[PDB]
Ligand binder design. Structure first.
Ligand SMILES: CCCCCCCCCCCCCCCCCC(=O)OC[C@H](COP(=O)([O-])OCC(O)COP(=O)([O-])OC[C@@H](COC(=O)CCCCCCCCCCCCCCCCC)OC(=O)CCCCCCCCCCCCCCCCC)OC(=O)CCCCCCCCCCCCCCCCC
Ligand SMILES: CCCCCCCCCCCCCCCCCC(=O)OC[C@H](COP(=O)([O-])OCC(O)COP(=O)([O-])OC[C@@H](COC(=O)CCCCCCCCCCCCCCCCC)OC(=O)CCCCCCCCCCCCCCCCC)OC(=O)CCCCCCCCCCCCCCCCC
Ligand SMILES: COC1=C(OC)C(=O)C(C/C=C(\C)CC/C=C(\C)CC/C=C(\C)CC/C=C(\C)CC/C=C(/C)CC/C=C(/C)CC/C=C(\C)CC/C=C(\C)CC/C=C(\C)CCC=C(C)C)=C(C)C1=O
Ligand SMILES: CCCCCCCCCCCCCCCCCC(=O)OC[C@H](COP(=O)([O-])OCC[N+](C)(C)C)OC(=O)CCCCCCCCCCCCCCCCC
Ligand code: SF4
Lengths: 115, 318, 175, 57, 155, 98, 83, 70
């Protein structure tokens, strides 16, 4: 009831503002006006050719790191159990393994960007 | 009148975002011995309206190499999510009393990067693609610590519902319990909002305008809407989390005033740091976190995991 | 109407699946999976589960962001394709969309389709159970028992993640 | 006559290293940077009211 | 009456345009230094509504400050093309106005007007930051005197 | 045997068909694989939430856990095919045929 | 001391963030076993009633089970009230 | 000389004030003065539904105490 009514309100307000922005100002367009901006002079020509990203290792291990937080997040409800010893051991196990993963990456170049 | 509440959570927020530009150009200018906007009416109280009028009547050119569809869907995505993430905030009584408000806001904050992503890629520019990739790296790095710090801080809350934070900080601000994490958290709020000294996605000095470089008139004003609404919402979330305030159940206006004042102070500190630092260099803001923020926040996560157990202070979930 | 809700969200789920299963440019496929994951989180939310849907949301947005970051870096072309640019991707999109159209057509009138499994499609509200969760959400206590009951799952998942980082290191070493 | 602008080796006494670590963890020179700009905001602006006020010639 | 309504709309739109003139960071030579000094605290462009902004897509007025040479003129013309309309060109300094000191050189455009339509000619070598502020205010009054919707009503 | 299950199963079927058919790229097939994973998660979550199998709600979380790991390994494989090949297309990956 | 103290001091000099993180982690690992309140925490989690204490059939013998909530025999949590 | 800055926050404060009060007042207006009852768990929702049933007029906020029973 409430949440999608909200979401709809935001999206229609945004689409409207786009509509007034794009139909009212009486644009006058020509080819050189929409030409790509390359600090003045005409671009060499690319903007879709492969763009090397040297943190590719870092970028991908972000996926595993952010994945572990899925295991981590049930903790506020996990603390309220009758087996606090096992819960504490397992939570520290997750955190220690993440520390070990980060340390292994740090020592074996890893987080350092490629050149 | 639920529609009334929804409109009352949008128009005032947009007006506050508009006046955020004026207070920024005044506070910053007074840092730099200038005076800031002063001509339009009294004390520049009409500048937000003036440039609002300009940006929606100036010609919104579409580049010949653009991808029309995503070039248009990105501003809508940005503004819609920036406005939506205001609904679960426990301003006296939250509009949408969700049981998982923190997780919801994390999800929408992670989604907000996709506006930058699609706007940068669809614009077909070297600078825009560069800025999009810098945004990729920045938001992933800082999102990891965002999630971990949120878990660590909320371990004392007992759940993820935003309203109970008010109950949690009934007698003491949470910052007195987790001041280290708070520092890191503040820095993360600086970076996820893509502000200084981590505003490398725009990089006015080195990337001209970053991912807004081919965005003109209305869509540009709209991306600015998203950015400033995110600034204010992040400062509001930080105020809700750490700097709690007294809440009389009979007069919620007192909590409204206190919360608004705390958000204003946090935003003013945002503009303060924006005008007092050089700018980070890409990898540094990554090497800052993956090598200094991440280990410290992991250690603090273990500490706050153990802390309720060692002191028999596990907060209730209900 | 609000009677079904889950039905319509499932159709958007399938449409998003068709979008990225048609082999478009990987950015467009990522967008299609994004909408599919969002509406799937909506379905899980509407089916009495809150944590699971938001977890899908967060995790899949992280994964798809990294997929984008790699796509414009490694798996790009001088001429990125659209769902209407090439005739092959257009054919795949057409096949998927008309297919699911006729599946839901055969579904929501007869409501007794046999396809693979017997599908009596009266309404998803029907299968819901009249129960009482008291003062604890069942899903919260369910995924909160991982640290108390599923210790073996904890061990195997942590070991798998650590060795996954190790292999992500070794594969990408490049001599 | 010449001076070495950057030829200062930091002391390695336990107090010195504790202070350096405190400055690193508890950002100290960063707080000084904040304080300088706070001090100048509270200062008087230098802008003149053109065209009602004209710069000296 | 319709004339009054379009008049008021003209005043509103012209006021917005003149009160939020966003210039471009296109300093070329010594005329840029004064272009900075009026951005300096003493004169402070910011109080007049004018804030510097690169990326021509989001700028209105171009202050051509400095000598415009042959090697740069194509870049200036192209960059002027990127500006979405309405656009204004303010010419700072004698060099950008008509040639200045190097008017008889081999690689200097004898006036920025030969490449873009210059809207305000600010004289000086270099013009005093007060003089450039005066030129900007003159451009502001120019925008104030626009009659777009009036002409549309009398199409 | 209820209705929503039909839609999720059908979505998984199209994702299985999409994975088993390549056109040009390697990223698209990986995306189709993670779509298969998404359909699996939604299906299993529906099943266990419906049956009130409270102890089994961790199962979709472990599903996603290994999901991300496989996606990561596959895209590292794509990194290497790009490093030794410049691009990621599969039809030019033929050096092992003989 | 000697090598160990010099290494600790050099680590404090060079990388204080790592030193702080390792110290906090070790503390958070080894203190909880030593602290006596841990058991208390468990008892608190056992004290909080989520499900109804379903009554059992009184076929006589059992003395400990109360016949009324106000009756003295049975488990009590005055310790939690005091603590 | 920063008091000229102060109006910018002032009106903005009013802006940030407007939702926080309005929602609260709305929650009081649409629920008969009292705070909006929040159902974070199924028990609270069951209580709200039984309130809606007992009220007879199909609004949960309308409460009946001793006068309703004999
Ligand atoms: C998933 C469904 C994807 C459906 C599809 O084909 O989307 C194409 C759509 C546009 O592709 P494009 O690469 O921008 O090329 C547009 C023109 O072909 C190239 O640019 P253009 O200037 O020709 O654009 C105008 C053009 C195309 O229309 C538009 O650009 C209007 C917006 C898209 C309409 C479809 O108008 C027409 O063809 C005539 C329309 C009458 O691409 C998308 O990614 C849209 C997906 C929307 C999904 C739902 C979002 C909520
Ligand atoms: C934090 C804010 C707390 C509330 C305002 C406190 C305040 O500024 O009191 C005035 C008074 C003087 O203003 P200022 O910020 O020092 O700047 C004075 C300059 O020297 C410049 O002074 P001046 O050389 O211009 O000579 C005297 C000047 C003195 O300035 C004033 O009279 C402005 C004070 C408001 C009237 O009189 C005028 O300039 C009158 C112009 C008034 C324009 C409208 C100001 C609206 C303020 C906000 C109203 C509520 C929203 O404040 C102080 O001396 C500091 C008091 C701090 C109290 C903190 C309590 C928490
Ligand atoms: C060594 O030699 C060198 C040269 O040698 C020749 C050179 O030449 C050069 C080059 C020369 C230069 C670079 C020139 C010098 C430049 C400078 C010194 C720079 C100076 C800059 C400044 C003074 C300004 C700095 C800016 C600051 C401090 C702040 C800027 C911030 C802002 C926010 C600006 C405002 C912008 C925007 C977009 C905000 C406005 C928008 C809004 C308010 C929108 C509001 C909208 C609404 C309210 C909508 C409301 C809607 C509602 C309610 C409903 C809607 C719904 C509907 C349905 C309709 C250099 C560098 C050089 O080194
Ligand atoms: C909230 C904003 C409320 C006010 C919105 C005003 C929008 C004005 C847009 C520009 C004027 C366009 C218009 O109405 O007529 C264009 C009219 C059309 O009349 P015209 O025949 O002179 O056309 C102008 C010249 N061409 C065709 C080359 C562009 O022109 C002008 O207003 C400018 C002269
Ligand atoms: S007009 Fe004078 S000050 Fe300006 S660029 Fe030419 S020589 Fe330099």
């Amino acid at each position: 009831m409430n949440i999608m009514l909200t979401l709809l309100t935001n999206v229609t307000l945004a689409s409207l503002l786009v509509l007034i922005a794009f139909w009212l100002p009486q644009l006058n367009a020509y080819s050189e006006k929409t030409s790509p901006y390359e600090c003045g002079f005409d671009p060499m020509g690319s903007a879709r050719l492969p763009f090397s990203m040297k943190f590719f290792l870092v970028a991908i291990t972000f996926l595993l790191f952010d994945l572990e937080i899925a295991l981590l997040l049930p903790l506020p409800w996990a603390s309220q159990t009758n087996n606090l010893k096992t819960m504490l051991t397992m939570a520290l196990f997750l955190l220690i393994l993440l520390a070990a993963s980060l340390a292994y990456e740090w020592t074996q170049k890893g987080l350092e960007w490629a050149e | 009148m639920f529609m009334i509440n929804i409109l009352s959570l949008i128009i005032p927020i947009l007006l506050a975002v508009a006046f955020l530009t004026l207070v920024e150009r005044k506070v910053l200018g007074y840092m730099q011995l200038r005076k800031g906007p002063n001509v339009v009416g009294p004390y520049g109280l009409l500048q937000p309206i003036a440039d609002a009028l300009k940006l929606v009547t100036k010609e919104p050119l579409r580049p010949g190499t653009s991808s029309i569809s995503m070039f248009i869907i990105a501003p809508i995505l940005g503004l819609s999510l920036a406005l939506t993430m205001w609904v679960p905030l426990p301003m006296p009584y939250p509009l949408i009393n969700m049981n998982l408000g923190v997780l919801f806001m994390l999800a929408m904050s992670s989604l907000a990067v996709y506006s930058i992503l699609w706007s940068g890629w669809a614009s077909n520019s070297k600078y825009a693609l560069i800025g999009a990739l810098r945004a990729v790296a920045q938001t992933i790095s800082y999102e990891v610590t965002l999630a971990i710090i949120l878990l660590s801080v909320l371990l004392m809350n007992g759940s993820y519902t935003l309203s109970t934070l008010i109950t949690t900080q009934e007698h003491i601000w949470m910052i007195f319990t987790s001041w280290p994490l708070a520092m890191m958290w503040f820095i993360s709020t600086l970076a996820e909002t893509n502000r200084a000294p981590f505003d490398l996605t725009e990089g006015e000095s080195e990337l001209v305008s970053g991912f807004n470089v081919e965005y003109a008139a209305g869509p540009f004003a709209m991306f600015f809407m998203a950015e400033y609404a995110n600034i204010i919402m992040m400062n509001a979330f930080t105020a809700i989390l750490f700097l709690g305030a007294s809440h009389d159940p009979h007069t919620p206006e007192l909590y409204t005033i206190n919360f608004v004042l705390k958000t204003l102070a946090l935003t003013i500190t945002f503009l303060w740091i924006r005008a007092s630092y050089p700018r980070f260099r890409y990898d540094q803001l990554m090497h800052l976190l993956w090598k200094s923020f991440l280990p410290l926040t992991l250690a603090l996560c273990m500490w706050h995991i153990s802390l309720p157990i060692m002191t028999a202070s596990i907060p209730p979930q209900s | 109407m609000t009677m079904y809700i889950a039905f319509i969200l499932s159709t958007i789920f399938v449409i998003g699946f068709v979008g990225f299963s048609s082999k478009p440019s990987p950015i467009y496929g990522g967008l299609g999976l994004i909408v599919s994951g969002g509406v799937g989180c909506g379905i899980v939310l509407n089916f009495g589960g809150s944590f699971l849907g938001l977890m899908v949301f967060l995790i899949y947005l992280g994964g798809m962001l990294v997929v984008f970051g790699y796509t414009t870096a490694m798996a790009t072309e001088m001429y990125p394709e659209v769902w209407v640019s090439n005739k092959t991707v257009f054919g795949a999109f057409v096949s998927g969309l008309m297919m699911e159209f006729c599946m839901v057509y055969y579904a929501l009138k007869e409501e007794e389709v046999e396809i693979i499994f017997k599908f009596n499609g009266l309404g998803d509200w029907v299968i819901y159970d009249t129960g009482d969760s008291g003062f604890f959400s069942e899903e919260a206590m369910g995924i909160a028992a991982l640290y108390s009951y599923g210790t073996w799952l904890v061990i195997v998942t942590g070991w798998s993640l650590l060795i996954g980082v190790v292999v992500i290191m070794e594969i990408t070493r490049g001599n | 006559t010449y001076k070495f602008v950057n030829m200062r080796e930091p002391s390695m006494d336990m107090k010195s290293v504790t202070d350096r670590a405190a400055q690193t963890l508890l950002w100290t020179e960063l707080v000084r940077g904040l304080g300088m700009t706070l001090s100048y905001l509270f200062r008087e602006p230098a802008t003149i009211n053109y065209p009602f006020e004209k710069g000296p010639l | 009456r319709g004339e009054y309504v379009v008049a008021k709309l003209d005043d509103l739109v012209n006021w917005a345009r003149r009160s939020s003139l966003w210039p471009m960071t296109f300093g070329l030579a010594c005329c840029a230094v004064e272009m900075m000094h009026m951005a300096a605290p003493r004169y402070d462009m910011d109080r007049f509504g004018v804030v510097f902004r690169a990326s021509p897509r989001q700028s209105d007025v171009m202050i051509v400050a400095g000598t415009l040479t042959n090697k740069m003129a194509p870049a200036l013309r192209k960059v002027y093309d990127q500006m979405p309309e309405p656009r204004y060109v303010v010419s700072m300094g004698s060099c950008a106005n008509g040639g200045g000191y190097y008017h008889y050189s081999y690689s200097v455009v004898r006036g920025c007007d030969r490449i873009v339509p210059v809207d305000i000619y600010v004289p000086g070598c270099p013009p005093t930051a007060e003089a450039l502020l005066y030129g900007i205010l003159q451009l502001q009054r120019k925008i104030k005197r626009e009659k777009r919707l009036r002409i549309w009503y009398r199409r | 045997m209820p209705l929503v299950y039909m839609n999720i199963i059908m979505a998984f079927a199209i994702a299985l068909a999409g994975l088993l058919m390549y056109r040009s790229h390697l990223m698209s097939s990986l995306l189709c694989l993670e779509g298969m994973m998404l359909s699996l998660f939604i299906m299993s979550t529906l099943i266990i939430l419906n049956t009130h199998f409270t102890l089994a709600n961790m199962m979709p979380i472990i599903l996603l856990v290994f999901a991300a790991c496989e996606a990561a390994l596959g895209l590292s494989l794509l990194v290497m095919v790009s490093n030794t090949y410049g691009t990621d297309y599969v039809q030019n990956l033929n050096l092992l045929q003989c | 001391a000697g090598r160990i103290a010099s290494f600790l001091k050099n680590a404090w000099a060079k990388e204080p963030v790592l030193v702080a993180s390792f110290a906090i982690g070790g503390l958070a690992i080894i203190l909880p076993s030593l602290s006596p309140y841990t058991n208390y925490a468990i008892r608190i989690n056992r004290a909080t009633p989520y499900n109804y204490p379903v009554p059992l059939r009184d076929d006589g013998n059992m003395p400990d089970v109360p016949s009324h909530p106000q009756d003295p025999q049975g488990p009590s949590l005055e310790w939690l009230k005091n603590l | 000389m920063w008091f000229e800055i102060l109006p910018g926050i002032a009106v903005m404060a009013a802006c940030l004030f407007i939702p926080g009060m309005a929602t609260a007042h709305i929650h009081k207006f649409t629920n008969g003065g009292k705070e909006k009852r929040v159902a974070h768990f199924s028990y609270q929702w069951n209580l709200m539904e039984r309130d809606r049933c007992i009220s007879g007029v199909n609004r949960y906020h309308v409460t009946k105490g001793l006068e309703n029973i004999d």
